[PDB]
Amino acid sequence: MFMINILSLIIPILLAVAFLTLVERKVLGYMQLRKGPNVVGPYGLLQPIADALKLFTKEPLRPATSSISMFIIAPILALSLALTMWVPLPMPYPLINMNLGVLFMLAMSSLAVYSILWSGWASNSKYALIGALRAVAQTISYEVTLAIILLSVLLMNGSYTLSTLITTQEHIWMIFTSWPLAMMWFISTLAETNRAPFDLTEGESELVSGFNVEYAAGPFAMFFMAEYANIIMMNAFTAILFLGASHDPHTPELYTINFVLKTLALTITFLWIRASYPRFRYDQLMHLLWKSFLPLTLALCMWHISLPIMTASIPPQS
Amino acid sequence: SRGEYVVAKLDDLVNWARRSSLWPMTFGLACCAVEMMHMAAPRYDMDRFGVVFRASPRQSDVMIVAGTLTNKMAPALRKVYDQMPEPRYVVSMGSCANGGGYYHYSYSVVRGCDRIVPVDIYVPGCPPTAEALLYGILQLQRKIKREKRLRIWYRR
Amino acid sequence: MWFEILPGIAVMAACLFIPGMATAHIHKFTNGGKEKRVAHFSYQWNLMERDRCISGVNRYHVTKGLENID
Amino acid sequence: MTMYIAFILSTIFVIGFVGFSSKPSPIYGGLGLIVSGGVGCGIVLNFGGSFLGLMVFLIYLGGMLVVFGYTTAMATEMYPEVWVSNKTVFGAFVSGLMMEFCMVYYALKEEEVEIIFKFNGLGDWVIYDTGDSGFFSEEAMGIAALYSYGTWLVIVTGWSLLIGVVVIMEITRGN
Amino acid sequence: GRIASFLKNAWAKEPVLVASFAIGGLAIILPSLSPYTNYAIRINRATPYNYPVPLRDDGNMPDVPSHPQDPQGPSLEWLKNL
Amino acid sequence: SMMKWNRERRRLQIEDFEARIALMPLFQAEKDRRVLQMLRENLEEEAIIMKDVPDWKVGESVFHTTRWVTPMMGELYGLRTNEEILSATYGFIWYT
Amino acid sequence: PFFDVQKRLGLDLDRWMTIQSAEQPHKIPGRCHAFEKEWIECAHGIGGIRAEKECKIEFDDFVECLLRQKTMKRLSAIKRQRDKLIKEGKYTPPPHHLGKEDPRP
Amino acid sequence: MNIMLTLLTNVTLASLLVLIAFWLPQLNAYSEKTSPYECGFDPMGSARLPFSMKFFLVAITFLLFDLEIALLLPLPWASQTNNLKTMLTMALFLLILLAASLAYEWTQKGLEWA
Amino acid sequence: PGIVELPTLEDLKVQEVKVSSSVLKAAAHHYGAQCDKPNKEFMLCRWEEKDPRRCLEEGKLVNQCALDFFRQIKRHCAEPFTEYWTCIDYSGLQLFRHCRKQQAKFDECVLDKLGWVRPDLG
Amino acid sequence: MPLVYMNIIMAFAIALAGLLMYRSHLMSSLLCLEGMMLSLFIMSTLIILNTHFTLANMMPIILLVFAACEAALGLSLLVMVSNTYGTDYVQNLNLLQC
Numbered sequence A: 001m002f003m004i005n006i007l008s009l010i011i012p013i014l015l016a017v018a019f020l021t022l023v024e025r026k027v028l029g030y031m032q033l034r035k036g037p038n039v040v041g042p043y044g045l046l047q048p049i050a051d052a053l054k055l056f057t058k059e060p061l062r063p064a065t066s067s068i069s070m071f072i073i074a075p076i077l078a079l080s081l082a083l084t085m086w087v088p089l090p091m092p093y094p095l096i097n098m099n100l101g102v103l104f105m106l107a108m109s110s111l112a113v114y115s116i117l118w119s120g121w122a123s124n125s126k127y128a129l130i131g132a133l134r135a136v137a138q139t140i141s142y143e144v145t146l147a148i149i150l151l152s153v154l155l156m157n158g159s160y161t162l163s164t165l166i167t168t169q170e171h172i173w174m175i176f177t178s179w180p181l182a183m184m185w186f187i188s189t190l191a192e193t194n195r196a197p198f199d200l201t202e203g204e205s206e207l208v209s210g211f212n213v214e215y216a217a218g219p220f221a222m223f224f225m226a227e228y229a230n231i232i233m234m235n236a237f238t239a240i241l242f243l244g245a246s247h248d249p250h251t252p253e254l255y256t257i258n259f260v261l262k263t264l265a266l267t268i269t270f271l272w273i274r275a276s277y278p279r280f281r282y283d284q285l286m287h288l289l290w291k292s293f294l295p296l297t298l299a300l301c302m303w304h305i306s307l308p309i310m311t312a313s314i315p316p317q318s
Numbered sequence B: 001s002r003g004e005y006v007v008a009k010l011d012d013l014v015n016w017a018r019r020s021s022l023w024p025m026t027f028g029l030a031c032c033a034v035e036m037m038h039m040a041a042p043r044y045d046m047d048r049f050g051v052v053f054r055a056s057p058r059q060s061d062v063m064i065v066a067g068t069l070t071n072k073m074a075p076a077l078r079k080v081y082d083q084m085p086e087p088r089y090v091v092s093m094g095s096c097a098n099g100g101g102y103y104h105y106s107y108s109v110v111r112g113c114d115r116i117v118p119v120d121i122y123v124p125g126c127p128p129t130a131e132a133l134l135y136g137i138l139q140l141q142r143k144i145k146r147e148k149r150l151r152i153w154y155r156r
Numbered sequence C: 001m002w003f004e005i006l007p008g009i010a011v012m013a014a015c016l017f018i019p020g021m022a023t024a025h026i027h028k029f030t031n032g033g034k035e036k037r038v039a040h041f042s043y044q045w046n047l048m049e050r051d052r053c054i055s056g057v058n059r060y061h062v063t064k065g066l067e068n069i070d
Numbered sequence D: 001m002t003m004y005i006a007f008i009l010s011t012i013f014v015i016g017f018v019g020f021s022s023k024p025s026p027i028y029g030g031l032g033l034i035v036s037g038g039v040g041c042g043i044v045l046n047f048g049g050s051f052l053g054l055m056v057f058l059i060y061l062g063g064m065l066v067v068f069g070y071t072t073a074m075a076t077e078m079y080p081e082v083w084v085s086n087k088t089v090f091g092a093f094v095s096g097l098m099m100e101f102c103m104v105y106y107a108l109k110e111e112e113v114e115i116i117f118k119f120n121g122l123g124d125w126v127i128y129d130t131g132d133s134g135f136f137s138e139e140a141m142g143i144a145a146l147y148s149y150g151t152w153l154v155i156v157t158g159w160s161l162l163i164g165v166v167v168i169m170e171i172t173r174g175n
Numbered sequence E: 001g002r003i004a005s006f007l008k009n010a011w012a013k014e015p016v017l018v019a020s021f022a023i024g025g026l027a028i029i030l031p032s033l034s035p036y037t038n039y040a041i042r043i044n045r046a047t048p049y050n051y052p053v054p055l056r057d058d059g060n061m062p063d064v065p066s067h068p069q070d071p072q073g074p075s076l077e078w079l080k081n082l
Numbered sequence F: 001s002m003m004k005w006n007r008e009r010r011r012l013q014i015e016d017f018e019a020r021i022a023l024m025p026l027f028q029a030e031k032d033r034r035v036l037q038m039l040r041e042n043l044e045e046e047a048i049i050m051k052d053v054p055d056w057k058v059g060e061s062v063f064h065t066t067r068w069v070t071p072m073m074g075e076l077y078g079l080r081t082n083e084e085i086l087s088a089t090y091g092f093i094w095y096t
Numbered sequence G: 001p002f003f004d005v006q007k008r009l010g011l012d013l014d015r016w017m018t019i020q021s022a023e024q025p026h027k028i029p030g031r032c033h034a035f036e037k038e039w040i041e042c043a044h045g046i047g048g049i050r051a052e053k054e055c056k057i058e059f060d061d062f063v064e065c066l067l068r069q070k071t072m073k074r075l076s077a078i079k080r081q082r083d084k085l086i087k088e089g090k091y092t093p094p095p096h097h098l099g100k101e102d103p104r105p
Numbered sequence H: 001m002n003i004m005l006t007l008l009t010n011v012t013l014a015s016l017l018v019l020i021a022f023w024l025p026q027l028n029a030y031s032e033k034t035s036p037y038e039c040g041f042d043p044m045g046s047a048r049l050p051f052s053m054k055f056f057l058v059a060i061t062f063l064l065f066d067l068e069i070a071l072l073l074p075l076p077w078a079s080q081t082n083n084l085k086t087m088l089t090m091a092l093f094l095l096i097l098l099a100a101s102l103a104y105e106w107t108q109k110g111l112e113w114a
Numbered sequence I: 001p002g003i004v005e006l007p008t009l010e011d012l013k014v015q016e017v018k019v020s021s022s023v024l025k026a027a028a029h030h031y032g033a034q035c036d037k038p039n040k041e042f043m044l045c046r047w048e049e050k051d052p053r054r055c056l057e058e059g060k061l062v063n064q065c066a067l068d069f070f071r072q073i074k075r076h077c078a079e080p081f082t083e084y085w086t087c088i089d090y091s092g093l094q095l096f097r098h099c100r101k102q103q104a105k106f107d108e109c110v111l112d113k114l115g116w117v118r119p120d121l122g
Numbered sequence J: 001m002p003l004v005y006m007n008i009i010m011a012f013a014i015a016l017a018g019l020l021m022y023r024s025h026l027m028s029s030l031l032c033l034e035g036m037m038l039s040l041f042i043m044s045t046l047i048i049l050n051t052h053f054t055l056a057n058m059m060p061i062i063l064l065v066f067a068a069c070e071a072a073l074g075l076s077l078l079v080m081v082s083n084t085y086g087t088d089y090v091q092n093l094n095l096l097q098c
């Protein structure tokens, strides 16, 4: 029955990604004095399905200069890793309960970056190469600060087990304890998911399509699905880490509802930011993270190391 | 025949997917592009109909030739059309694109984009009003709705 | 108006809700109406193996209480 | 087949090494290094080293990122080489795979192979210990003793890293 | 006096660095002067990670208890009150 | 609030560790008896298995020392079924 | 040129990790603590030249605990004999080894 | 094994999607359609020529800082020791050395580009 | 070298405490309070001797004492203990926190019928 | 020794042979150095975990730290070589002879 559980996690997540596309289109339109898609289906509900069918019934083109093996492998890696990262999340009970789930998610996010770089390099197009290099710069900018913030926050948890975050935040949200780290973490999640104002890899205005400029039909659909799934998964991680939820062991549905609502709110915030702010220059993104976020993260990491000791609040290891 | 019914229904599904999700490429040559942007503007928002502007030719389904096509720009237009994956549809907007319009007798103007690329729907006007362009796009959607690829496959 | 956005959000919310509920109820079904035991350290896995031996059906969730004694 | 997950992963590790060692273009050698790092993580996790394995994967994932960027900048070539683009690279790849297959079958079939040391074909499960670690992760407790026991190692490593930043700055000054 | 000028210039021009340095300095200093750090050490010691091996009784160990719930031996009342 | 909650968590962890301490001696007795029984069964079946083989002492120690050495996984589960071997060797690692 | 500054100044810069039998966090024992302790105690103050032969039994026991080469060889021989007997048809694994009896808790 | 099964399932789903994308659609591949994309005109040189990295120093420093990320991750378990004084001193020593390295590179115009 | 002197199967046969982990954890504190003596004797034997064979009899005594403890529980406080260990079983981590009320019932019943007092923290 | 030790030592041998047999690029040989470091990490971790040498489970992490230090040094040298010659090719390190 574990296979049933894996399918239950996978299939609904992909449908959630599909309808997230509709939600984004409508939210941005309404924030722009427009109505998002409404013609296709009641209130635009069937637009995602039409988009998926159109993309998968569209000719996929293999670039003449492309390296076919990497060109094909990259979307597979992106989608599979995007689906994999959802596994360890406690909602409330995780599909795979790992002692070090947080480090697993960090490593898997690191692995997903190669999908963008491999896609851009294999495309053998100048714009794709520029997008891949931008992705490299983005990872260089954000990875260290992301890891340090996660370590600082998890010091109060006492472990890297995602499930134990629920117990730690039983009485209060961790955002109250670590609201600055929460802000830097939210921006870093925006950077990791390559979302505005850090949508540099794709950068339609500056790079025609970035790394996916040479991708069409199914592979592009896979890249889009990976992107949106990563958005949802990272926002869910933020909800678990900071905006904890009440869990009644006899009724998990309450925790599941609270968690889903918080993640929806965070994803809506993502779309809101994409609508509101302009895009950063990748030099500016790297400067922001290294010159502004990194020193504050180091100072706050020192603070969070000291605070449990000086306040006798060291969390239980188990 | 049951096979004919299955083919007809699958063709209906494919045509509905293709017409509902029509992604024009970000290609605007001349003044007609401005009316295209006004079509993208809130009043006649084309996103409601599923028409979303996508820059990359490989991620686009429709090319709208808005503006005069000079002899200098024609090879680039043909290249962009060729690099666009199929099914691909071309809409010619404005008199300049349709047949050369005001600059028909110029040395530097292609007297119609039909000479360079096949055109499916011609939207008259100079500039065509945004409502006219939306009407043309919906006409292209109906044309897609009338397509019978799978039925012809079964009958062939 | 803005309420028109809500239906897609509701569909997305239901899709997201399905995974956690499915995981919890599948764990309940597989583990005999009780939460799947968490073994983050070797001691708990040893307890689970001992329960597997005690049960007699090679299922750890089956719990033998005072009745088995004497 | 699940009785020998470790052996399969180690063979994949050796194949990745034969991939990045035949020296294709740095991109595909980086692919090999990434695959080998993942497989090594798998092996260490199978032996009980979850933190160590995940740390290797994370560090090599970041390291190969800078390698990929550097390649596209310095180690670049107009026609980058794959393991089937040159007789030398394919020769090295085939020789490495054959040498593995040779030792693999030799040790699996023969009870005790001895290439340079003596190796026993019995599955890795045999060596594992029967003790219990209780409410503890021995790897985690040992790795955490770097701050309580290994003050000297912390001093040396921190100084090495600061001097490494200085060294990179000086080596790249370029006068 | 000039130190105040430097601090004002820092807060105007580089607030993030001022905040970071202040937080780091507090992290360094405050734990030394905190009463509760010894409480943290005692809590970590009190945690019974490994079994309390009994010791053979030679008849000359008054302080060592002969059985839990006996008045002799360590007490954890401080942590309960904490 | 986090200080209060974490101190309570440490106290509850102490409670759980004390429960484990109370239960450990019985577990140690069970484990020793089980290991000895498995070793005896292995010894007897080996006596059956290699009676014919020349110059093979049965149950001979590979250590010079006449001291108890904790048996390795192979000794206890060497001749048991594959499912038992997989469980003993990789269960805690694989369990998730 | 091994200037024993650690011994001169009484500083345990690195000797804490030199051996597996030394103090470890939470008194977690090494897999060969007994053998290592016996070998160290045997070869203490007698010099390396003497210890290489007068404590060879201890060192061999330590190596056997570390690598299990002899134990693995014996187990492999037993398994080979059992498989050969099964092929011959003159041996049958007991039901408890086959899983027909509940193992002791 | 559960993690292996999940990874296999996800990879198989992705590969099946790729297969369906490359086999269900109809194709009319011709040279001009599969040529590289350069905004309509043809590319001048290759996309495999060297692409100067103006942030090389930051990348090497990123490697060196990811090492410190690795060294600092055990801290959650370190806080469980009895020698919290030495643990705190060494953790702050490592973090202050990382801060010093960042400050040195910054003041020496190392975090700047080109 | 020498033959390993493994004990016979009959000698290592003992009555077994066939109760699940949740049941043991529910009674863990009172079990340690009541059966401390034999358990401590077995532990001292195990740690001093360093041979599992040498301390078999003390382990048998440990098992017998645990059985007697559970028998007294069954005689006097069966139902409250059954509810208590049922409550602990549901939690995957078998946490004590969620079952405080049933634990209070069990402790009060045990204190009244048998006089046992739960050991305090530490 | 189990066969996994054989495979990991074989990986180290292969990486050493790769490093000692250059072809053109320097990046590939630096990758062979990093591969050797990975193989050493795996061997040390396996030994320390099988022998339950608790206070030695940190040695792999220090080995990785100094491996990354070495990698940084290698890349910082490769950048200068590329700047002075335009490529990372080893054949350009030919000014010093004998």
Ligand code: SF4
Residues within 6 Å of the ligand: B030, B031, B032, B033, B066, B067, B068, B094, B095, B096, B097, B101, B102, B125, B126, B127, B128
């Ligand atoms: S048709 Fe008229 S509006 Fe359109 S580009 Fe030509 S002149 Fe401008």
